[PDB]
A paper describes a structure:
A previous report showed that a F. novicida transposon mutant with insertions in cadA (FTT_0406), which encodes a putative aspartate aminotransferase fold (AAT-fold) pyridoxal 5′-phosphate (PLP)-dependent lysine decarboxylase (hereafter referred to as LdcF), was attenuated in mouse spleen. Bacterial AAT-fold PLP-dependent basic amino acid decarboxylases are grouped into a superfamily termed LAOdc because these enzymes decarboxylate lysine (LdcI, LdcC and LdcA), arginine (AdcI) and ornithine (OdcI and OdcC) into corresponding polyamines (cadaverine, agmantine and putrescine) while consuming protons and producing CO2. LdcF sequences found in Francisellaceae strains display a high level of sequence identity (83%), and contain four functional regions, corresponding to a wing domain (Pfam ID: PF03709), a PLP-binding domain and a AAT-like domain (both corresponding to Pfam ID: PF01276), and a C-terminal domain (Pfam ID: PF03711).
We were able to determine the structure of F. novicida LdcF from X-ray diffraction data collected to a resolution of 3.4 Å. In agreement with the relationship between LdcF and LdcI families disclosed by the phylogenetic analysis and the relatively high level of sequence conservation, structural alignment between F. novicida LdcF and E. coli LdcI dimers extracted from their respective decameric crystal structures demonstrates a high overall similarity, with a root-mean-square-deviation (RMSD) of 1.043 Å over 1,223 aligned atoms. The core domain encompasses a linker region (residues 113–184), a PLP-binding domain consisting of a seven-stranded β-sheet surrounded by eight α-helices (residues 185–419), and an AAT-like domain which harbors an antiparallel four-stranded β-sheet and three α-helices near the dimerization interface (residues 420–564). While the overall structures of LdcF and LdcI are very similar, some notable differences were found in both the AAT-like and the C-terminal domains. Moreover, a comparison of the ppGpp binding pocket in LdcI with the equivalent region in LdcF revealed that, despite the overall high sequence conservation, only two out of 10 ppGpp-interacting residues are conserved between the two proteins.
Residue numbers in the entry:
A (entry chain B), B (entry chain A): -5 to 711
C (entry chain C): -5 to 174
The structure:
């Protein structure tokens, strides 16, 4: 009923050179399907074409085939693509079934050639509208259905289903741009038929339970203000001010944000990295009981054994921890994986024992997985899931949920995250991830195959050498490709779908004589309309998601080796990078691409930046004061602003966040000493290097550029 | 360029009986406007019709009139409706201008009757597409423009502009339902052309500054997780754990939520109310220096004079404080109005000195106004503004902003709140509020005019007797209509647009012999598809917003006196309230509406509920422990669960929230004693009364209904 | 849903010599009602004609009238003929209600002259299909609904929903005569 695809197509596939009366039959119900309830139609010669189309277009919503075109193979493939898809086999009184389908569960019905044709046309339409109703998840379906009502409300939201946008001109332009339905599904608790999110009521409860069942979770919660909010919910549930928490040193901005409002003391788990500035794994040693007890003794406050653990898995650049090996070693009852970058983890075999929800909670221990559903699944931004496992307290976590969830949640986002769960439900999800995985691996192999053919220099991939078999490849001490120190046997895996491209300039995780900085590649990808996830000094991160077709990757390939063409060409910066040229044409007057690149590479070789960034994040500065209490001193006022140089031997009042590499260097309350001088040297270097060449800049969040230009940091008391 | 209204109409208005060659001229450019760039057209007889249409339809985007139809009046009225609206006056070489337009600034150009007609059609199209570009606010326009690009991205969000929803069927149904553009404008910071929200960069800054200028604010911040989040931002900026805060006792759920994670002690400002359970104003006395200093001495913890003040203005039911009179009396430097229910306040004269932003911050004192833009303007849910005033610290509030704002904000919501500012910009906003105000007053006057004619009983309005003049009427001690105690001269105003309907049953703010409970009216409004904002035991709240047409109010009128018709009819509960009847037809077998209603009224008269609710919220229970520390005890575990009866003499661990009236009764950490026995009596009464009649229920958030049904509350230690 | 009169007619009655933009409004939703879900339309000059027609034809299933043509008498008579019959009054931002209707229980909704016309056309269609569902008695409605299912039965009666009449010629003539 009025809820269906945009391009509703029904695929007629009967073998060409049918009988005359069977052709008239299938065409009568084709016209009938068109002229009643506005369908679209394809005609094909065999079912093999349909399975091709289904892997690209999913707005086909029925298959009616003459029995001649019946194919055992296609039905096996259609089975593994869409079990609910309506199928119709038209046959006369002559032929019985193929036995393969006894077991196979498709939505097959059988028509007989006869007088009644428009009857079948109505029969087909019904089983289609059933298919359309029976594919939305509960709350989404409920929400969508409500939209079609006409309610005449005197309540919130104030736009009251769109009527408020119509009164003004700019309102009308906004309304038309975004579409009727987004406003008609913008409801509040004042429309009681859906219940509440914070209450987990009629519709919402059904949605929350659905998601939990889908992700193999004991209990799941939907969050409409990003994983940043989900992380804080977990914390304020697990942690009361006073006890100690175990923190991944390479954690999200939001982890610190949580620490900053509860009087809690962290010990950080020292992770590895390479000269590229790629986040590595926390070695197993750090998780051991003895390492924890010792680090507690050495911390300043350090109440006792941590009640709370937060480890980011996977890393931004796609390294995966074995979650089984971690839980075996971590005797912390509230341990929380920040799995923002792997909501798909639980749906593919290659991630066996690499997602939180895969482990059985140890007796009276609680597991938390926070996932950013929008980050790598199909959902609206700000939409996130909170999966928990084991014995838990609804009475108190509901309050922790209420602490951060708004009282007027935006229902389309609620629907969107539930719908993303329904996308992953069943072997539907497996194929969805399998595609993006196979595509990524193809891009990896296709790029090194180009490196072989390539003359002179060429790009490279941050991956093992042998990637023949399709797995999340395991890092090994032996191989120097990852550039990490002391990695354990069978602990770290590489996520195939996260492709890090490497530009010449890093030999043995240190500086290089000749190179080509990544910044001059990123800009060239930007000139040719390509958006990169992250750009290192010599690396480049592309994330192949379920929204990445092979065509996109061919575009990426073609522009990439074109950059080499135009760089070996040594074309003018004007003709090659017009945006960079336009920033200062006086400076780039007759400059060519090689001059610009080599001058940037020279200044990094002169600054000795790679191993500076190495030793900067490989030391951990003396923690003087609780991040919470450091922020509190900002409020209370006891803090003074002194230049970056004078940060030495003082206690930082705010977080410092340099780009590159886009990683917290120091948290609020920590202090730099002789031991941790490395980080301040790296910072002061970023200043000089960030100025020199126009168009290539540096940023450090936390300090303040004054009138005089000098950058002061606020230090405590 | 490809950004325009849906029904782009251009109004031709030339006086009937034109000249033959002038007729053909205007028609040649009408056809040209239709067949090129797909315009729609109206023809009218005089400009007076146009001003009528413009006040109902704002997708007319040009007016081309023959000079005969020129009207001095209409052009003054069109001026006060849309100055940017393109106007075209076609005239021959015969007539000079009317002088009125010297002052008036319309978008008038002048055409001359001649050969070149299609030229003018192109000239008209340009000045229209200029109008379409020049009405969106900066970030919204920038966001909308980006949608039209084709970027081939390998970044977040994972749906990558919608391409991820296409791979699956349920994805496609979700994608089609909501529309292409909502996904193409779902961006991240990874597309650097817009900058960041938390950074307040190129596009965002322009939007943030625009809003601040629009609402007459020193500095404004946009919030994408509701005012609930905005409130917490304000708090964690203004408050460090240890000092005391001044709280409106009738505050939002979110105010407490803020208190629960900062170690802060509140003193509550006792507000008034009536038997109906309508939230009243805090009397001026409570704000005085002596009342504050005294209540501090009397509190348990009470560090010192509060650094932070939070008062909710307006009330849920539309009572307004004089913000000037408050700031004069409250020597608290960080004072924060929770103006969720009045984002429109600053745009209409009747709210003079009733909004925060209207007062000059006292030297070194900071003012905060948090507004729920979605609550009573045209914006998406979760969208809220944070307006501040005076000397402030960006370096620290940026951290407070970052503490609660997600790292991946949903850009359409960002755009939506900025667009809502642009809707209010200029006298555009004045007329928008003036309409909803005049409509409200009309509904009020027409309803009491119906009460006069009405036979026997009828509804009433919670308003003064004399409402002849169009003002925010001021409450007076003398008049018994508001039922409040000790109201000050010129302190409390009634917001016209918030209509509270009253059903018989409350005589002199106490019980009544005969009545008709509001619940049996709400259900009847629900049966007839009408959504109420809030329902009291004998009241009903309709909020007339800018999304409320007169047709809605006539629908509301017609169903209302129909309820009286069917109640005086004494129709069967089956035929009158089928949903209620269906819940238990065994019980309502042959019951009529009067029996059901009178039995409910009798049980409230027997329970003595109205004055029970009165004395419940008019006492304030002994605060035993900080709300923060009470919640912390849940985490730490020191808490036991005992039934509601046994809450007496114990310290509550969680907030209790009864419906009715939908107001916090006790906060975490407070304790009931003999003095505050009233509230627990009211609670235990709500149990008995909530059971008895089927379909009419009661709810109390905070306790827990067990297996046996009995409701335990968790009490501390 | 697919259960309705044969001649589904919707009576537009707006006073001749309407305003130009109000004429286009009611006609835009008249065409919209025709071309989507196949309605039939009458145009009349006053409501007095409608009460005449209702006492002869009961396949009119909605009345959408401009507020000019509002009539106190006809609404009292329509009340005593069909309380459930959908009524729609289109009016601009100018006029409040006549008090007679306070007591009278019709199926009146109110439209406002504005941009959104096809929206109202969808709003009208919904309140009509509600009227069509809400007039059959329980068992009749249940029986009628079942007919629209496709069940593939192996039970009694032996004709199994008509399929048995199709196999023979005389069967087909009997089936066609009496109807699916």
């Amino acid at each position: 009923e009025n809820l269906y695809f945009q391009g509703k197509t029904v695929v007629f596939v009967y073998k060409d050179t049918l009988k005359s009366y069977k052709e008239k039959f299938l065409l009568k119900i084709e016209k009938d399907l068109k002229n009643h309830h506005e369908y679209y139609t394809l005609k094909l010669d065999d079912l093999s074409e349909v399975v091709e189309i289904l892997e690209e277009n999913s707005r086909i919503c029925c298959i009616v085939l003459d029995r001649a075109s019946f194919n055992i193979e296609a039905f096996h493939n259609i089975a593994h693509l869409n079990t609910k898809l309506p199928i119709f086999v038209a046959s006369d009184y002559s032929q019985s079934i193929k036995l393969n389908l006894r077991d196979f569960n498709l939505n097959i019905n059988f028509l007989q050639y006869d007088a009644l044709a428009g009857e079948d046309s109505d029969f087909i339409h019904k089983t289609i509208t059933n298919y359309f109703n029976d594919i939305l998840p509960p709350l989404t379906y409920e929400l969508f259905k409500y939209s079609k009502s006409f309610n005449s409300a005197f309540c919130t939201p104030g736009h009251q289903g769109g009527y408020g946008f119509q009164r003004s001109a700019v309102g009308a332009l906004f309304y038309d741009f975004y579409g009727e339905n987004i406003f008609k599904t913008d409801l509040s608790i004042s429309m009681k038929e859906l219940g509440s999110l914070l209450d987990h009521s009629e519709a919402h409860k059904d949605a929350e339970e659905y998601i939990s069942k889908v992700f193999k979770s004991d209990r799941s919660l939907i969050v409409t203000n990003g994983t940043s909010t989900a992380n804080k919910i977990v914390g304020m549930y697990s942690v009361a001010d006073g006890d100690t928490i175990l923190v991944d040193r390479n954690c999200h901005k939001s982890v610190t944000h949580l620490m900053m409002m509860v009087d809690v003391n962290p010990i950080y788990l020292k992770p590895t990295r390479n000269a590229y500035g790629i986040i590595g794994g926390i070695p197993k040693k750090e998780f051991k009981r003895e390492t924890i007890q010792e680090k507690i003794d050495n911390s300043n406050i350090a109440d006792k054994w941590p009640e709370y653990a937060v480890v980011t898995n996977s890393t931004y650049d796609g390294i995966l921890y074995n979650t089984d090996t971690i839980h075996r070693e971590l005797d912390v009852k509230k341990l929380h994986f920040d799995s923002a970058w792997i909501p798909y983890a639980i749906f593919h075999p290659i991630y066996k024992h690499k997602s939180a929800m895969q482990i059985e909670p140890r007796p009276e221990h609680i597991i938390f997985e926070t996932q950013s559903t929008h980050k790598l699944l199909a959902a609206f931004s700000q939409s996130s899931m909170l999966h928990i496992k084991g014995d838990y307290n609804e009475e108190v976590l509901n309050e922790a949920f209420m602490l951060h969830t708004s009282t007027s949640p935006f229902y389309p986002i609620v629907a969107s995250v539930e719908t993303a769960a329904a996308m992953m439900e069943g072997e539907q999800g497996y194929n969805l991830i399998d595609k993006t995985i196979n595509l990524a691996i193809d891009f990896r192999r296709e790029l090194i195959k180009l490196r072989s053919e390539a003359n002179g220099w060429f790009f490279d991939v941050w991956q093992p050498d042998n990637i023949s078999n399709k797995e999340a490849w395991l890092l090994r001490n032996a191989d120097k490709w990852h550039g990490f120190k002391n990695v354990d046997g069978d602990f770290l895996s590489l996520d195939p779908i996260k492709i890090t491209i490497l530009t010449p300039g890093i030999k043995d995780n240190d500086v290089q004589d000749w190179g080509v900085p990544a910044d001059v590649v990123a800009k060239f990808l930007d000139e040719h309309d390509i958006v990169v996830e992250k750009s290192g000094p010599y690396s480049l991160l592309f994330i192949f998601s379920l929204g990445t077709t092979k065509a996109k990757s061919v575009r990426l390939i073609s522009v990439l080796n074109k950059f080499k063409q135009m760089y070996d060409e040594n074309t003018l910066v004007e003709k090659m990078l017009p945006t960079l040229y336009a920033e200062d044409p006086k400076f780039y007057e007759d400059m060519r691409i090689q001059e610009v690149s080599e001058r940037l590479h020279q200044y990094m070789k002169e600054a000795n930046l790679p191993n500076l960034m190495y030793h900067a994040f490989n030391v951990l500065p003396e923690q003087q004061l609780n991040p919470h209490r450091a922020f509190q001193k900002l409020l209370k006022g006891k803090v003074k602003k002194v230049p970056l140089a004078e940060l030495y031997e003082h206690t930082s009042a705010v977080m410092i966040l340099p780009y590159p590499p886009g990683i917290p260097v120091i948290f609020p309350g920590e202090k730099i000493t002789e031991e941790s001088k490395v980080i301040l040297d790296f910072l002061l270097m970023l200043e000089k290097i960030g100025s020199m060449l126009p168009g290539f800049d540096t940023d450090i969040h936390g300090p303040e550029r004054a009138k005089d230009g000098k950058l002061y940091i606020k230090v405590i008391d």
